[PDB]
């Protein structure tokens with residue numbers, strides 16, 4: 001059913017720095033996530049050029065932003081490449097151990113938390129605004145899995161029995177209570193325009 005894993009020591013540290021350092025520019029999480037979505041879409045697009053059947057699990061290449069004021073979640077959905085079970089457990093396909101080290105050194109030489117994406121670890125910036133992150137992913141080579149973590153050093157992975165998704169990743173951010181500004185339509189729009197204005201895939205902002 002549910003497997004529980006410990007994060008490697010450098011990720012646990014990376015997540016704790018993110019959660020504990022006072023840093024008011026939290027809004028960069030969205031860009032970091034849309035930027036992961038865009039890389040994952042590049043990937044399925046490049047593979048499909050030589051094997052069109054990779055798009056049998058969906059032809060449309062895009063990003064959806066889904067706010068839900070009742071559940072208090074912001075969900076970032078793409079129909080990108082997805083992750084296999086092994087890649088989800090291996091730091092969601094990131095080079096988190098070496099990127100974190102390098103990032104921490106840059107933080108001592110004048111870098112700041114907004115540069116997290118330059119180190120291949122921007123996914124973890126979700127924890128600037130989220131108390132819990134769930135990630136649902138479907139790779140063409142595998143079943144559908146849910147990853148989840150509220151930090152504190154562990155994450156869980158299970159087969160996902162929610163609704164089948166064709167292919168891609170949904171990052172579901174359960175927001176901290178003081179961060180609900182990220183569920184507001186004109187907030188999200190503003191942030192997309194400031195940091196992700198020109199991206200190679202269409203972004204749809206869902207309304208409620």
Ligand SMILES: CSc1nc(C)nc(N)n1
Pocket residue numbers: 036037040078080081082083092093123169
């Ligand atoms: C490798 S596919 C992928 N990986 C991450 C971290 N996020 C998304 N959206 N896709």
